[PDB]
Amino acid sequence: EVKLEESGGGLVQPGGSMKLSCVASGFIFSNHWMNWVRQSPEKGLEWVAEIRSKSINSATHYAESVKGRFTISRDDSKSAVYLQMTDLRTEDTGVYYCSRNYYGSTYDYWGQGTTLTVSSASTKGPSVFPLAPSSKSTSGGTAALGCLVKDYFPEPVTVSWNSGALTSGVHTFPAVLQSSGLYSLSSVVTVPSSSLGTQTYICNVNHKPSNTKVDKKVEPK
């Protein structure tokens, strides 16, 4: 199994710096070309940088829109590829994917992405409130419950239920930007109404830029 795992995203002021990392496994790392490809609502999928093998001088190539500001590097002893970003701009905001390109053809493996936000605003961790089940959130044999993840910045937060053991029926809604400048979202799950008060439901909320890791037990009302 090939795996690529990015990290290092977060919030940075305009003009600031930030270094992304990616660790690879499942192929002979030092023989292959590692890439960063970013994604944003405005520009879609956009190749950013490539570093090729040590055997051909670890040659680095950059998209014209980041040339001079970004530096890609690799450490073959760690199976790591890095992206040092400087003089960051608002338009650099996006999801940054670590990706392998098969010698100038397909991007045949991708990581899961790490999110970069270039903004003058500050980091704020979320507050987490239960959306408690009751008869008012029961529809026949289905009950709904959830978690309200309120007043955080920047994106993203991840939510899981019962430490990931509960995935069926879960909807985590796209975040909305409130007038305050802070994001807000709800994660809900639908369950059998008979399981209210007999099964435990805990939403696990993670907001890395503020190092919030909160588990919230959601109880019937």
Binding site: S105, S127, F129, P130, A132, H171, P174, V188
Partner: protein
């Protein structure tokens, strides 16, 4: 640089039908077009390389064709699990470029939403704010109307809605509407109601509660 034009940007098809995605290159790219699938909250997955060679593990209903500047991705019988965005990519010349993507919606029979309402939590109320949430779960088609009434007074400008992307297991959408009030304005009223209209409902559905019950 080579521009890949993917048009149309949205496709909507019924299950069991054949669907075709179009990718046109502004210059000759030979056969060096690659197709990717990106599911909601996921990463692009390689499907076809070099216009028509499907990768190992891709279901056989996927196939590609074309050469020169005109390329097609086909799904000969579409299922809900095929709901995603589809991107093309050229590696004929540097730099490699991607199309803008086409989104695939798979139609289904009309499904009225289940409607649920949640009062604000005691914890949030202690912080001075009351958020009331109305959930419209697993409906189709996407269009739905949500109105907040507080003691039968229609509310305006104090709510926000968020809609999920179409679900690949059952082709439905879900929607949340959050009404936010100060604790002071929350305590000045009693009845908090959520009213939902949708193609699948024979008449509007109202979910409500009395504050403090």
């Amino acid at each position: 640089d080579i521009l890949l034009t993917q048009s149309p940007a949205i496709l909507s098809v019924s299950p069991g039908e054949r669907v075709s995605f179009s990718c046109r290159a502004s210059q000759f790219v030979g056969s060096s077009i690659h197709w990717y699938q990106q599911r909601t909250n996921g990463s692009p997955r390689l499907l076809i390389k070099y216009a028509s060679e499907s990768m190992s593990g891709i279901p056989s209903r996927f196939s590609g064709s074309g050469s020169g500047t005109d390329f097609t991705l086909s799904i000969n019988t579409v299922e809900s699990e095929d709901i995603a965005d589809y991107y093309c990519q050229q590696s004929h010349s540097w730099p490699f470029t991607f199309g803008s993507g086409t989104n695939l919606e798979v139609k289904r029979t009309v499904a009225a939403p289940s409607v649920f309402i949640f009062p604000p939590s005691d914890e949030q109320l202690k912080s001075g704010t009351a958020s009331v949430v109305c959930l419209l779960n697993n409906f189709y088609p996407r269009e739905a109307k949500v109105q907040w009434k507080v003691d039968n007074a229609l509310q305006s400008g104090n709510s926000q809605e968020s809609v999920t992307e179409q679900d690949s297991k059952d082709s439905t959408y879900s929607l949340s509407s959050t009404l936010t009030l100060s604790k002071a304005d929350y305590e000045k009223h009693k009845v908090y109601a959520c009213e939902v209209t949708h193609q699948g409902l024979s008449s509007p559905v109202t979910k409500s509660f009395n504050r403090g019950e």
